[PDB]
Amino acid sequence: EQISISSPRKRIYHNILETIGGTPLVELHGVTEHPRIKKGTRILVKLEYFNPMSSVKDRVGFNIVYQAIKDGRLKPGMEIIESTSGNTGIALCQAGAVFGYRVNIAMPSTMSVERQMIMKAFGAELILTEGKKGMPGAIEEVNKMIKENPGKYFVANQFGNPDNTAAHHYTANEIWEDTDGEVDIVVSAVGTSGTVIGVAEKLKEKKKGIKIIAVEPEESAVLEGKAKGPHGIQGIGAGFIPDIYKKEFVDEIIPIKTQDAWKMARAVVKYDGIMCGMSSGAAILAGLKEAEKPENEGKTIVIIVPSCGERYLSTDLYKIKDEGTKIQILDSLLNE
Amino acid sequence: EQISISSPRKRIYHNILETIGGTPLVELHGVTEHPRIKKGTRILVKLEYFNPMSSVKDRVGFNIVYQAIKDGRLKPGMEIIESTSGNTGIALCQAGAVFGYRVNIAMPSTMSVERQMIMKAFGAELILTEGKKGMPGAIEEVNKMIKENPGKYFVANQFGNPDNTAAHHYTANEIWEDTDGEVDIVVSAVGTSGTVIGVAEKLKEKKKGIKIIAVEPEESAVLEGKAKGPHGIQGIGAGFIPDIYKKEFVDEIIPIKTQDAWKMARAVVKYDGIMCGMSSGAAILAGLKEAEKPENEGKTIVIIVPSCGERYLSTDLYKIKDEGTKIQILDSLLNEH
């Protein structure tokens, strides 16, 4: 009932990249108000929008670029390039601005125009490709650019680069230390899969039998062997199995409908005051569905929240209103 | 150098309000590379967008609501209300959501519709007033509402509430601990003045000789005794001296032109990779101007960075494009005699 805000960090950071990581683990209470969710079961959300550019990909852009520089894969006179219309391009733009490397981001001229402006603010060169060509048209142009200029480009390659996965060994360490080794279940919505696999690798090194749950859109359930299809959960459901995915490390895969993800995210900001994005809505509903299983009474369940709702204001996320009491809303999410 | 990311917090937070404060203090390097800034002076920015809703006001919405609950000014049955179309409204909605109070936020129908959406998501009731009426219109409606419903509402009153200034005693302690007591100058762009006064009150207790600098728009230099005027530095330059402002605690006031504040913020994100907002461009430019004074050689200068540039994507902050190299840009920002 006493409320203590955070204490001083007692650190002076040398640049913005040193503020990446060490993201806070916060108890959910509002949305966990269910008779079937026992009071000893703990439901915690790891808020990756505390990163400097407000997303989990900050860790990925940083590690990919910093390791490439240390590796000699990225050297002076070269430039970074990466086809992406998401948070990865922002994170690559942030790392390139700090390290002093030009960043080329290719995306359909169609896409994330707010995100275009973010990327240009950082000094990125944007490579806007034909809208009706989607992301395949962006990847196509990157390839053409590499081929026409050998030696010039370092490709981030977020779905095939193990420096992605490896960045989440820190994410894992943070979950282990913050929970004092009590974590039982981790739930992660899957885009590149760097988070689910990197967290799993490192936690299973600490405790075999931590349960690792991947989340993906019901409308595009490729990890569960379904076909790529249209869905609305931004940041996840890439439509293929990333080359960095390692199925051995994932214990269960939970599909979540696009509309249910959005409705969960609406309930989390309303009842817990936590403004999470759409993929977080998916992860959290999967986590609540675990928290109501009898076998999981008293367990500690940690749910990754990759981004904040502010990056979704031009989407449909908040535009749909929800009927009912809190208990009605939660019952409709957990039922059928 | 070796670059190391942040360590685990080693804390499980009981709710999102416990993640407010303890924001990071970061060195500037890119934008400090100008021949008139010395190698020894340390220029640091305190990034208040690390708060859970990405601005300094998180501390203020929290402490206003918390202290009123502790005092008995806010009690079960009452609702919160505040005329604001800044970050304070968001910070009140977040505090209200966690404490379980209804929040009513008044603003012109035409102002910050991105922020309206943010507020509605938190469950706030929006009171949208005539656009042409402006801020005054919203305040007038708040006044009408409290007049007609005596006892129902708790007014945050951000410009006159000492719980605003008091929240920044924590900001000050963070500056003190993070610098190991070496802080010499604090630069804060002034909106409510909770930050510059609350920081000054607590730091001036720690050591003699910490210089406190307030920053306001050139075109509305009201702390300097000039007349109010139109300006484009969002979050500062209220046009009046706030009731919580205490001039005794401020050593110097630096006026900064709107377009200079924007250009600074553009340079900070491109050369330091730090995406700060408009008022941060103002504070940082003032802080660089201090760093070039010979009397300030080797000192530690701490500049408050109240918000992130992503909250500004629909303004002209990033539309205007600066030609020229880094050194031309910095040399043009420090130009004035």
PDB file of N, CA and C in Angstrom, chain B residues 193-280:
ATOM      1  N   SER B 193       7.547  24.540 -14.112  1.00  0.00           N
ATOM      2  CA  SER B 193       8.707  24.802 -13.263  1.00  0.00           C
ATOM      3  C   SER B 193       8.799  23.826 -12.103  1.00  0.00           C
ATOM      4  N   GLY B 194       7.970  22.763 -12.059  1.00  0.00           N
ATOM      5  CA  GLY B 194       8.181  21.755 -10.972  1.00  0.00           C
ATOM      6  C   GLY B 194       9.640  21.227 -10.979  1.00  0.00           C
ATOM      7  N   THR B 195      10.141  20.895 -12.174  1.00  0.00           N
ATOM      8  CA  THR B 195      11.494  20.335 -12.319  1.00  0.00           C
ATOM      9  C   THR B 195      12.624  21.277 -11.883  1.00  0.00           C
ATOM     10  N   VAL B 196      12.691  22.494 -12.408  1.00  0.00           N
ATOM     11  CA  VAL B 196      13.829  23.346 -12.097  1.00  0.00           C
ATOM     12  C   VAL B 196      13.766  23.754 -10.625  1.00  0.00           C
ATOM     13  N   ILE B 197      12.579  24.033 -10.081  1.00  0.00           N
ATOM     14  CA  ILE B 197      12.507  24.449  -8.656  1.00  0.00           C
ATOM     15  C   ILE B 197      12.761  23.269  -7.704  1.00  0.00           C
ATOM     16  N   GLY B 198      12.075  22.157  -7.945  1.00  0.00           N
ATOM     17  CA  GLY B 198      12.209  20.938  -7.087  1.00  0.00           C
ATOM     18  C   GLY B 198      13.621  20.435  -7.091  1.00  0.00           C
ATOM     19  N   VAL B 199      14.237  20.357  -8.284  1.00  0.00           N
ATOM     20  CA  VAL B 199      15.695  20.022  -8.326  1.00  0.00           C
ATOM     21  C   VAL B 199      16.588  21.033  -7.535  1.00  0.00           C
ATOM     22  N   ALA B 200      16.396  22.330  -7.776  1.00  0.00           N
ATOM     23  CA  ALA B 200      17.183  23.387  -7.124  1.00  0.00           C
ATOM     24  C   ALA B 200      17.022  23.320  -5.589  1.00  0.00           C
ATOM     25  N   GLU B 201      15.780  23.110  -5.115  1.00  0.00           N
ATOM     26  CA  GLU B 201      15.521  23.096  -3.661  1.00  0.00           C
ATOM     27  C   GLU B 201      16.399  22.027  -2.990  1.00  0.00           C
ATOM     28  N   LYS B 202      16.419  20.818  -3.571  1.00  0.00           N
ATOM     29  CA  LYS B 202      17.112  19.710  -2.965  1.00  0.00           C
ATOM     30  C   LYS B 202      18.639  19.795  -3.231  1.00  0.00           C
ATOM     31  N   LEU B 203      19.047  20.129  -4.461  1.00  0.00           N
ATOM     32  CA  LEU B 203      20.480  20.192  -4.704  1.00  0.00           C
ATOM     33  C   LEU B 203      21.177  21.322  -3.943  1.00  0.00           C
ATOM     34  N   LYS B 204      20.544  22.460  -3.828  1.00  0.00           N
ATOM     35  CA  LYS B 204      21.159  23.547  -3.105  1.00  0.00           C
ATOM     36  C   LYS B 204      21.374  23.263  -1.621  1.00  0.00           C
ATOM     37  N   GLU B 205      20.727  22.230  -1.122  1.00  0.00           N
ATOM     38  CA  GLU B 205      20.981  21.669   0.174  1.00  0.00           C
ATOM     39  C   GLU B 205      22.249  20.852   0.189  1.00  0.00           C
ATOM     40  N   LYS B 206      22.585  20.211  -0.901  1.00  0.00           N
ATOM     41  CA  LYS B 206      23.722  19.301  -0.924  1.00  0.00           C
ATOM     42  C   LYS B 206      25.065  20.038  -0.941  1.00  0.00           C
ATOM     43  N   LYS B 207      25.192  21.073  -1.741  1.00  0.00           N
ATOM     44  CA  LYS B 207      26.460  21.752  -1.886  1.00  0.00           C
ATOM     45  C   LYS B 207      26.281  23.146  -2.391  1.00  0.00           C
ATOM     46  N   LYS B 208      27.133  24.035  -1.950  1.00  0.00           N
ATOM     47  CA  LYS B 208      27.078  25.388  -2.417  1.00  0.00           C
ATOM     48  C   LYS B 208      27.659  25.428  -3.815  1.00  0.00           C
ATOM     49  N   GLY B 209      27.102  26.268  -4.657  1.00  0.00           N
ATOM     50  CA  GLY B 209      27.709  26.568  -5.918  1.00  0.00           C
ATOM     51  C   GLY B 209      27.195  25.800  -7.102  1.00  0.00           C
ATOM     52  N   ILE B 210      26.051  25.182  -6.964  1.00  0.00           N
ATOM     53  CA  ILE B 210      25.414  24.446  -8.119  1.00  0.00           C
ATOM     54  C   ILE B 210      24.561  25.447  -8.849  1.00  0.00           C
ATOM     55  N   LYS B 211      24.867  25.700 -10.114  1.00  0.00           N
ATOM     56  CA  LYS B 211      24.197  26.762 -10.799  1.00  0.00           C
ATOM     57  C   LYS B 211      22.916  26.213 -11.458  1.00  0.00           C
ATOM     58  N   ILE B 212      21.807  26.889 -11.256  1.00  0.00           N
ATOM     59  CA  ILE B 212      20.526  26.368 -11.751  1.00  0.00           C
ATOM     60  C   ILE B 212      20.056  27.271 -12.880  1.00  0.00           C
ATOM     61  N   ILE B 213      19.817  26.696 -14.068  1.00  0.00           N
ATOM     62  CA  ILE B 213      19.505  27.515 -15.228  1.00  0.00           C
ATOM     63  C   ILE B 213      18.148  27.083 -15.765  1.00  0.00           C
ATOM     64  N   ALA B 214      17.226  28.045 -15.862  1.00  0.00           N
ATOM     65  CA  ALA B 214      15.918  27.833 -16.442  1.00  0.00           C
ATOM     66  C   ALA B 214      15.998  28.211 -17.917  1.00  0.00           C
ATOM     67  N   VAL B 215      15.234  27.514 -18.728  1.00  0.00           N
ATOM     68  CA  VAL B 215      15.239  27.796 -20.225  1.00  0.00           C
ATOM     69  C   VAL B 215      13.819  28.078 -20.651  1.00  0.00           C
ATOM     70  N   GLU B 216      13.604  29.131 -21.459  1.00  0.00           N
ATOM     71  CA  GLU B 216      12.231  29.425 -21.963  1.00  0.00           C
ATOM     72  C   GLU B 216      12.360  29.926 -23.405  1.00  0.00           C
ATOM     73  N   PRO B 217      11.257  30.019 -24.105  1.00  0.00           N
ATOM     74  CA  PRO B 217      11.295  30.483 -25.467  1.00  0.00           C
ATOM     75  C   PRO B 217      11.553  31.948 -25.505  1.00  0.00           C
ATOM     76  N   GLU B 218      12.426  32.269 -26.419  1.00  0.00           N
ATOM     77  CA  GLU B 218      12.744  33.602 -26.802  1.00  0.00           C
ATOM     78  C   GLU B 218      11.512  34.454 -27.059  1.00  0.00           C
ATOM     79  N   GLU B 219      10.534  33.838 -27.708  1.00  0.00           N
ATOM     80  CA  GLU B 219       9.354  34.547 -28.160  1.00  0.00           C
ATOM     81  C   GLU B 219       8.311  34.626 -27.064  1.00  0.00           C
ATOM     82  N   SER B 220       8.655  34.173 -25.861  1.00  0.00           N
ATOM     83  CA  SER B 220       7.668  34.240 -24.800  1.00  0.00           C
ATOM     84  C   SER B 220       8.424  34.234 -23.509  1.00  0.00           C
ATOM     85  N   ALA B 221       9.338  35.193 -23.382  1.00  0.00           N
ATOM     86  CA  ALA B 221      10.318  35.188 -22.303  1.00  0.00           C
ATOM     87  C   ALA B 221       9.748  35.781 -21.023  1.00  0.00           C
ATOM     88  N   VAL B 222       8.711  35.131 -20.506  1.00  0.00           N
ATOM     89  CA  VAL B 222       7.968  35.652 -19.391  1.00  0.00           C
ATOM     90  C   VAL B 222       8.697  35.575 -18.028  1.00  0.00           C
ATOM     91  N   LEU B 223       9.527  34.548 -17.819  1.00  0.00           N
ATOM     92  CA  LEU B 223      10.349  34.519 -16.597  1.00  0.00           C
ATOM     93  C   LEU B 223      11.351  35.682 -16.526  1.00  0.00           C
ATOM     94  N   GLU B 224      11.846  36.107 -17.692  1.00  0.00           N
ATOM     95  CA  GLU B 224      12.748  37.278 -17.833  1.00  0.00           C
ATOM     96  C   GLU B 224      12.008  38.640 -17.785  1.00  0.00           C
ATOM     97  N   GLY B 225      10.698  38.580 -17.649  1.00  0.00           N
ATOM     98  CA  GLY B 225       9.880  39.774 -17.496  1.00  0.00           C
ATOM     99  C   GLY B 225       9.403  40.304 -18.847  1.00  0.00           C
ATOM    100  N   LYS B 226       9.671  39.564 -19.927  1.00  0.00           N
ATOM    101  CA  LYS B 226       9.081  39.930 -21.248  1.00  0.00           C
ATOM    102  C   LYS B 226       7.648  39.492 -21.416  1.00  0.00           C
ATOM    103  N   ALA B 227       7.021  39.951 -22.486  1.00  0.00           N
ATOM    104  CA  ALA B 227       5.622  39.652 -22.713  1.00  0.00           C
ATOM    105  C   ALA B 227       5.512  38.287 -23.350  1.00  0.00           C
ATOM    106  N   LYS B 228       4.422  37.611 -23.032  1.00  0.00           N
ATOM    107  CA  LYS B 228       3.999  36.379 -23.653  1.00  0.00           C
ATOM    108  C   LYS B 228       3.899  36.534 -25.171  1.00  0.00           C
ATOM    109  N   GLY B 229       4.089  35.444 -25.896  1.00  0.00           N
ATOM    110  CA  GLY B 229       4.033  35.520 -27.340  1.00  0.00           C
ATOM    111  C   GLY B 229       3.928  34.131 -27.908  1.00  0.00           C
ATOM    112  N   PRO B 230       3.586  34.014 -29.194  1.00  0.00           N
ATOM    113  CA  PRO B 230       3.467  32.684 -29.828  1.00  0.00           C
ATOM    114  C   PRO B 230       4.856  32.079 -30.093  1.00  0.00           C
ATOM    115  N   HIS B 231       4.935  30.762 -29.870  1.00  0.00           N
ATOM    116  CA  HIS B 231       6.197  30.029 -29.997  1.00  0.00           C
ATOM    117  C   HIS B 231       5.820  28.584 -30.304  1.00  0.00           C
ATOM    118  N   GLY B 232       6.791  27.818 -30.787  1.00  0.00           N
ATOM    119  CA  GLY B 232       6.543  26.445 -31.190  1.00  0.00           C
ATOM    120  C   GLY B 232       7.295  25.387 -30.318  1.00  0.00           C
ATOM    121  N   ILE B 233       7.749  25.762 -29.106  1.00  0.00           N
ATOM    122  CA  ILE B 233       8.489  24.785 -28.288  1.00  0.00           C
ATOM    123  C   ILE B 233       7.452  24.133 -27.369  1.00  0.00           C
ATOM    124  N   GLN B 234       6.831  23.057 -27.837  1.00  0.00           N
ATOM    125  CA  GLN B 234       5.798  22.354 -27.081  1.00  0.00           C
ATOM    126  C   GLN B 234       6.297  21.899 -25.735  1.00  0.00           C
ATOM    127  N   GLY B 235       5.446  22.070 -24.696  1.00  0.00           N
ATOM    128  CA  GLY B 235       5.691  21.631 -23.292  1.00  0.00           C
ATOM    129  C   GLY B 235       6.318  22.715 -22.434  1.00  0.00           C
ATOM    130  N   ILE B 236       6.769  23.813 -23.078  1.00  0.00           N
ATOM    131  CA  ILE B 236       7.267  24.929 -22.237  1.00  0.00           C
ATOM    132  C   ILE B 236       6.561  26.226 -22.656  1.00  0.00           C
ATOM    133  N   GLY B 237       6.964  27.311 -22.018  1.00  0.00           N
ATOM    134  CA  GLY B 237       6.556  28.681 -22.416  1.00  0.00           C
ATOM    135  C   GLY B 237       5.059  28.775 -22.172  1.00  0.00           C
ATOM    136  N   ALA B 238       4.638  28.668 -20.912  1.00  0.00           N
ATOM    137  CA  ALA B 238       3.235  28.658 -20.626  1.00  0.00           C
ATOM    138  C   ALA B 238       2.588  30.043 -20.872  1.00  0.00           C
ATOM    139  N   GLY B 239       3.408  31.092 -20.868  1.00  0.00           N
ATOM    140  CA  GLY B 239       2.894  32.457 -21.081  1.00  0.00           C
ATOM    141  C   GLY B 239       2.655  33.224 -19.810  1.00  0.00           C
ATOM    142  N   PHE B 240       2.938  32.617 -18.654  1.00  0.00           N
ATOM    143  CA  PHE B 240       2.690  33.228 -17.350  1.00  0.00           C
ATOM    144  C   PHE B 240       3.745  32.662 -16.415  1.00  0.00           C
ATOM    145  N   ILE B 241       3.930  33.283 -15.255  1.00  0.00           N
ATOM    146  CA  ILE B 241       4.874  32.709 -14.305  1.00  0.00           C
ATOM    147  C   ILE B 241       4.043  31.767 -13.398  1.00  0.00           C
ATOM    148  N   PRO B 242       4.388  30.439 -13.360  1.00  0.00           N
ATOM    149  CA  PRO B 242       3.552  29.518 -12.563  1.00  0.00           C
ATOM    150  C   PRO B 242       3.665  29.901 -11.079  1.00  0.00           C
ATOM    151  N   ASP B 243       2.579  29.630 -10.364  1.00  0.00           N
ATOM    152  CA  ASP B 243       2.515  29.883  -8.951  1.00  0.00           C
ATOM    153  C   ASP B 243       3.589  29.094  -8.146  1.00  0.00           C
ATOM    154  N   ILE B 244       4.065  27.939  -8.654  1.00  0.00           N
ATOM    155  CA  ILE B 244       5.074  27.174  -7.970  1.00  0.00           C
ATOM    156  C   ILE B 244       6.538  27.619  -8.312  1.00  0.00           C
ATOM    157  N   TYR B 245       6.710  28.577  -9.222  1.00  0.00           N
ATOM    158  CA  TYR B 245       8.004  29.100  -9.563  1.00  0.00           C
ATOM    159  C   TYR B 245       8.600  29.916  -8.404  1.00  0.00           C
ATOM    160  N   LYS B 246       9.868  29.694  -8.106  1.00  0.00           N
ATOM    161  CA  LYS B 246      10.514  30.467  -7.044  1.00  0.00           C
ATOM    162  C   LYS B 246      11.822  31.024  -7.582  1.00  0.00           C
ATOM    163  N   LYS B 247      11.835  32.292  -7.931  1.00  0.00           N
ATOM    164  CA  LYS B 247      12.971  32.893  -8.571  1.00  0.00           C
ATOM    165  C   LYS B 247      14.278  32.827  -7.794  1.00  0.00           C
ATOM    166  N   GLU B 248      14.197  32.789  -6.479  1.00  0.00           N
ATOM    167  CA  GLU B 248      15.379  32.733  -5.639  1.00  0.00           C
ATOM    168  C   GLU B 248      16.224  31.558  -6.004  1.00  0.00           C
ATOM    169  N   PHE B 249      15.590  30.483  -6.442  1.00  0.00           N
ATOM    170  CA  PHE B 249      16.325  29.233  -6.685  1.00  0.00           C
ATOM    171  C   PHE B 249      16.955  29.121  -8.063  1.00  0.00           C
ATOM    172  N   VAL B 250      16.696  30.109  -8.910  1.00  0.00           N
ATOM    173  CA  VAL B 250      17.177  30.085 -10.296  1.00  0.00           C
ATOM    174  C   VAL B 250      18.318  31.114 -10.449  1.00  0.00           C
ATOM    175  N   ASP B 251      19.459  30.664 -10.906  1.00  0.00           N
ATOM    176  CA  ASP B 251      20.601  31.544 -11.147  1.00  0.00           C
ATOM    177  C   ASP B 251      20.580  32.299 -12.460  1.00  0.00           C
ATOM    178  N   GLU B 252      20.114  31.697 -13.530  1.00  0.00           N
ATOM    179  CA  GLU B 252      20.158  32.341 -14.818  1.00  0.00           C
ATOM    180  C   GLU B 252      18.978  31.847 -15.631  1.00  0.00           C
ATOM    181  N   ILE B 253      18.464  32.665 -16.519  1.00  0.00           N
ATOM    182  CA  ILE B 253      17.416  32.207 -17.468  1.00  0.00           C
ATOM    183  C   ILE B 253      17.938  32.377 -18.887  1.00  0.00           C
ATOM    184  N   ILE B 254      17.823  31.331 -19.702  1.00  0.00           N
ATOM    185  CA  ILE B 254      18.338  31.385 -21.048  1.00  0.00           C
ATOM    186  C   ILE B 254      17.173  31.315 -22.019  1.00  0.00           C
ATOM    187  N   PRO B 255      17.001  32.350 -22.889  1.00  0.00           N
ATOM    188  CA  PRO B 255      15.954  32.249 -23.905  1.00  0.00           C
ATOM    189  C   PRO B 255      16.497  31.482 -25.135  1.00  0.00           C
ATOM    190  N   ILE B 256      15.639  30.677 -25.778  1.00  0.00           N
ATOM    191  CA  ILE B 256      16.064  29.885 -26.932  1.00  0.00           C
ATOM    192  C   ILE B 256      14.983  30.007 -28.017  1.00  0.00           C
ATOM    193  N   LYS B 257      15.357  30.267 -29.257  1.00  0.00           N
ATOM    194  CA  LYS B 257      14.399  30.484 -30.315  1.00  0.00           C
ATOM    195  C   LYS B 257      13.831  29.157 -30.749  1.00  0.00           C
ATOM    196  N   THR B 258      12.565  29.133 -31.096  1.00  0.00           N
ATOM    197  CA  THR B 258      11.879  27.918 -31.483  1.00  0.00           C
ATOM    198  C   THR B 258      12.622  27.113 -32.520  1.00  0.00           C
ATOM    199  N   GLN B 259      13.047  27.759 -33.583  1.00  0.00           N
ATOM    200  CA  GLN B 259      13.673  27.047 -34.649  1.00  0.00           C
ATOM    201  C   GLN B 259      15.030  26.504 -34.258  1.00  0.00           C
ATOM    202  N   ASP B 260      15.704  27.161 -33.329  1.00  0.00           N
ATOM    203  CA  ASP B 260      16.962  26.672 -32.810  1.00  0.00           C
ATOM    204  C   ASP B 260      16.787  25.405 -31.943  1.00  0.00           C
ATOM    205  N   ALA B 261      15.755  25.437 -31.130  1.00  0.00           N
ATOM    206  CA  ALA B 261      15.360  24.266 -30.288  1.00  0.00           C
ATOM    207  C   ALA B 261      15.085  23.058 -31.176  1.00  0.00           C
ATOM    208  N   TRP B 262      14.258  23.221 -32.241  1.00  0.00           N
ATOM    209  CA  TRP B 262      14.030  22.127 -33.186  1.00  0.00           C
ATOM    210  C   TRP B 262      15.324  21.635 -33.821  1.00  0.00           C
ATOM    211  N   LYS B 263      16.165  22.559 -34.335  1.00  0.00           N
ATOM    212  CA  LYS B 263      17.389  22.125 -35.018  1.00  0.00           C
ATOM    213  C   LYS B 263      18.325  21.364 -34.071  1.00  0.00           C
ATOM    214  N   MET B 264      18.432  21.848 -32.838  1.00  0.00           N
ATOM    215  CA  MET B 264      19.211  21.121 -31.822  1.00  0.00           C
ATOM    216  C   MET B 264      18.721  19.659 -31.653  1.00  0.00           C
ATOM    217  N   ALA B 265      17.399  19.502 -31.459  1.00  0.00           N
ATOM    218  CA  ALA B 265      16.812  18.186 -31.282  1.00  0.00           C
ATOM    219  C   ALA B 265      17.104  17.318 -32.501  1.00  0.00           C
ATOM    220  N   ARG B 266      17.037  17.858 -33.710  1.00  0.00           N
ATOM    221  CA  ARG B 266      17.425  17.081 -34.905  1.00  0.00           C
ATOM    222  C   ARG B 266      18.860  16.644 -34.856  1.00  0.00           C
ATOM    223  N   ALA B 267      19.750  17.488 -34.289  1.00  0.00           N
ATOM    224  CA  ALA B 267      21.195  17.212 -34.325  1.00  0.00           C
ATOM    225  C   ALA B 267      21.471  16.137 -33.255  1.00  0.00           C
ATOM    226  N   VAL B 268      20.745  16.232 -32.132  1.00  0.00           N
ATOM    227  CA  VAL B 268      20.955  15.258 -31.025  1.00  0.00           C
ATOM    228  C   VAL B 268      20.609  13.826 -31.473  1.00  0.00           C
ATOM    229  N   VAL B 269      19.524  13.680 -32.216  1.00  0.00           N
ATOM    230  CA  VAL B 269      19.155  12.324 -32.644  1.00  0.00           C
ATOM    231  C   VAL B 269      20.078  11.827 -33.712  1.00  0.00           C
ATOM    232  N   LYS B 270      20.506  12.693 -34.610  1.00  0.00           N
ATOM    233  CA  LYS B 270      21.369  12.195 -35.709  1.00  0.00           C
ATOM    234  C   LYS B 270      22.814  11.967 -35.267  1.00  0.00           C
ATOM    235  N   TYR B 271      23.374  12.800 -34.357  1.00  0.00           N
ATOM    236  CA  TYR B 271      24.798  12.675 -33.969  1.00  0.00           C
ATOM    237  C   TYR B 271      25.048  11.984 -32.670  1.00  0.00           C
ATOM    238  N   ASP B 272      24.013  11.908 -31.820  1.00  0.00           N
ATOM    239  CA  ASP B 272      24.148  11.129 -30.581  1.00  0.00           C
ATOM    240  C   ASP B 272      23.183   9.975 -30.535  1.00  0.00           C
ATOM    241  N   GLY B 273      22.309   9.913 -31.522  1.00  0.00           N
ATOM    242  CA  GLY B 273      21.326   8.779 -31.527  1.00  0.00           C
ATOM    243  C   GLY B 273      20.361   8.799 -30.363  1.00  0.00           C
ATOM    244  N   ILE B 274      20.067   9.994 -29.846  1.00  0.00           N
ATOM    245  CA  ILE B 274      19.153  10.171 -28.708  1.00  0.00           C
ATOM    246  C   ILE B 274      17.918  10.923 -29.210  1.00  0.00           C
ATOM    247  N   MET B 275      16.748  10.294 -29.223  1.00  0.00           N
ATOM    248  CA  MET B 275      15.611  11.009 -29.882  1.00  0.00           C
ATOM    249  C   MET B 275      14.825  11.903 -28.911  1.00  0.00           C
ATOM    250  N   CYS B 276      15.310  13.075 -28.663  1.00  0.00           N
ATOM    251  CA  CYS B 276      14.700  13.938 -27.614  1.00  0.00           C
ATOM    252  C   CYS B 276      13.639  14.821 -28.279  1.00  0.00           C
ATOM    253  N   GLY B 277      12.784  15.407 -27.450  1.00  0.00           N
ATOM    254  CA  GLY B 277      11.686  16.196 -27.950  1.00  0.00           C
ATOM    255  C   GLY B 277      12.104  17.655 -28.112  1.00  0.00           C
ATOM    256  N   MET B 278      11.111  18.499 -28.447  1.00  0.00           N
ATOM    257  CA  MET B 278      11.447  19.934 -28.711  1.00  0.00           C
ATOM    258  C   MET B 278      12.038  20.672 -27.532  1.00  0.00           C
ATOM    259  N   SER B 279      11.375  20.562 -26.390  1.00  0.00           N
ATOM    260  CA  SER B 279      11.840  21.309 -25.219  1.00  0.00           C
ATOM    261  C   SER B 279      13.233  20.801 -24.835  1.00  0.00           C
ATOM    262  N   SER B 280      13.502  19.507 -25.091  1.00  0.00           N
ATOM    263  CA  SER B 280      14.891  19.010 -24.898  1.00  0.00           C
ATOM    264  C   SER B 280      15.897  19.651 -25.803  1.00  0.00           C
TER     265      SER B 280
END
